[PDB]
Amino acid sequence: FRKMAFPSGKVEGCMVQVTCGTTTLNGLWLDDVVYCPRHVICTSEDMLNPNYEDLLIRKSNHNFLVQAGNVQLRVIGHSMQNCVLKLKVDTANPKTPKYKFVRIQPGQTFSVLACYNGSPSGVYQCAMRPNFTIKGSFLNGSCGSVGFNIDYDCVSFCYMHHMELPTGVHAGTDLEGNFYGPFVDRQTAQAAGTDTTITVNVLAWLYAAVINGDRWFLNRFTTTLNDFNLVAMKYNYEPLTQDHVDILGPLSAQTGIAVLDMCASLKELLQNGMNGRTILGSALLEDEFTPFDVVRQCSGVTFQ
Amino acid sequence: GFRKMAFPSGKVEGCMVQVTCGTTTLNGLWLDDVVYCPRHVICTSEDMLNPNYEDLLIRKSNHNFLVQAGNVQLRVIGHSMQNCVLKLKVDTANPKTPKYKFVRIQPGQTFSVLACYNGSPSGVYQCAMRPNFTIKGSFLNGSCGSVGFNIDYDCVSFCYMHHMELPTGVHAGTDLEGNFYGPFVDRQTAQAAGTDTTITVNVLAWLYAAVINGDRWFLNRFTTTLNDFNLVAMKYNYEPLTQDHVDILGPLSAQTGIAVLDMCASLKELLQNGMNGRTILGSALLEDEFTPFDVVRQCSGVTFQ
Ligand SMILES: *[C@H](O)[C@H](C[C@@H]1CCNC1=O)NC(=O)[C@H](CC(C)C)NC(=O)OCc1ccccc1
Ligand SMILES: *[C@H](O)[C@H](C[C@@H]1CCNC1=O)NC(=O)[C@H](CC(C)C)NC(=O)OCc1ccccc1
């Protein structure tokens, strides 16, 4: 079972660079709008506590350099929405895919197209942690790189990159510019909350193990959802929501193992450990595969 | 903790097509006016058990090949076989053909795979060519003709085309000249690989990545000679470390201030003592599928912990 990213071509065709002065970051070009982090308008001095409303009133369309490679796109309008800048340009991107902007929950996975100077560098899969941070590679110049999922022909953009926290983890916004988590776009030390294990994804991975015939951990017990949630919290596992129970439905149906029976199996693994045994060849419980990821990787779903 | 990163797949996505012969469907790679695909597309279920490919191919005409680029049929106007790959000349040039090369990769090197089904891209992930010439991929029925590649500037270097799954669940395939990596054959028979070994230079690169990310518990004050390291490495079915490998670890050694032979002494202790339930970069196992180049790409401008 490997992390698999979505094919990145539909997103590569949307990446541009945005420059104010000597500050360059990435933007997302959809139709005739370029979306990017608003801190492109900040200088070194502005960054500790920028007054973004005051910095933006001093900017005109002609102050923004938007480039698709070396090709300039003329800016014909600008506005700020939360922590994102929207630059209207005079050219509709002919590579614009069918798309949506979505706000994801903790535990949801997405692909990141890491970009520098508007040029795609790499693609990887990551998970939104319960503390609203992501673990992955973002270097200087990576801001405005996006996270996404693809369903059939349609790109759901869920993340735009803004900052690195002291622990080396990353924080950003949805494409409406609202941060995930209690973070703000200013050059100040900010701490993430204590992270927890993504319970719904551990359950998905136990279902994946059962599908592949690795089922030694199936016990003969059940639990209520409330009793499970109170025990899970003692082991720094996220409580399950009704939505989590429902998204496990397909794997529960495929395996014939009721969700609350799998919860009872996980509770015994937390209380007793694995006693030297492995699951899918791992001594560690994996929490960055969603129920969708398990079905996707076992069933060979494509996109176009 | 430290993630595998694939190359952006768009330049390859624009080359993927579907190839069908009778009821056998797989993927092809469309470059200029040629579609490259695994030759076993010409086999029925029965043929795949023990195929005489020259005999099976002479019984085929251009019209027996259905090539589809999405909805659009590409007319086949010529065919030839090069080792285990079929080359279908079509009457249309692919406008999305990138600058490209065909390369044969060395064991220990990494590449990105674009897994495809019915000519449609499904997923992208990083693989290493193992010393036993298998890859640990994710490939289902219909995945054959999926390719592996690296990208340098604008240029796609295609190194792998997918053909089969071994009984152990690992994967085997060819270069784009149709020559298998490893002692495998394109027949529906159970095939074992040679006993695999661990890619030593890649483990060392990953331990450097761990140190750069502040994960340092495994460092020690032993050093070793290269020869004495290699004696222990070989005992544990690790590949020998060459002076060329020591040289390519130079930049990571400079970044961390840990001499390559000091990192070798750390790895020797990990092999002899195990990890004792501890993790490195959140892994319970020593990872050998990042090259020094792969690590340098992610660690370049990182501030030392
Ligand atoms: C945007 O490209 C950049 C991304 C950071 C830089 C290093 N890795 C990243 O993920 N964001 C910032 O520089 C950001 C700007 C503020 C106005 C939000 N500040 C930030 O992340 O500060 C922490 C930091 C900066 C530079 C190097 C290491 C950490
Ligand atoms: C091409 O789409 C397909 C890919 C396989 C299917 C499952 N996962 C994969 O990677 N290749 C084959 O089906 C291949 C065709 C031969 C004519 C090369 N057969 C195959 O891999 O068989 C392996 C095997 C045969 C007999 C016993 C045990 C394993």
Side-chain angles (χ1 to χ4, degrees), chain B residues 26 40 48 53 139-144 162-167 171 185-190:
Chain B
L26 45 60
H40 72 257
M48 284 181 188
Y53 283 106
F139 293 108
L140 305 174
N141 287 348
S143 62
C144 286
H162 186 51
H163 295 244
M164 60 195 313
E165 185 168 307
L166 304 190
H171 295 105
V185 289
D186 50 340
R187 176 182 168 185
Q188 190 75 31
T189 198

Side-chain angles (χ1 to χ4, degrees), chain B residues 107-109 128-136 170 193-203 230 232-241 245 271 286-289:
Chain B
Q109 293 300 125
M129 182 57 64
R130 309 287 319 150
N132 73 355
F133 292 106
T134 67
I135 69 174
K136 301 181 184 166
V170 306
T195 80
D196 203 14
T197 55
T198 301
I199 309 155
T200 308
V201 63
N202 290 3
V203 176
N230 280 331
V232 175
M234 287 172 30
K235 182 185 188 190
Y236 288 94
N237 272 325
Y238 273 55
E239 287 285 293
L241 193 70
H245 292 146
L271 296 179
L286 300 179
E287 292 239 43
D288 76 342
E289 294 207 357

Side-chain angles (χ1 to χ4, degrees), chain A residues 2 9 12 123 135 288 301 304, chain B residues 3 6 10 13 120 122 126:
Chain A
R2 56 177 322 137
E12 288 169 56
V123 61
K135 297 180 192 176
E288 293 200 355
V301 177
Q304 233 150 1
Chain B
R3 291 191 190 283
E13 290 170 50
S120 294
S122 178
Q126 266 311 84

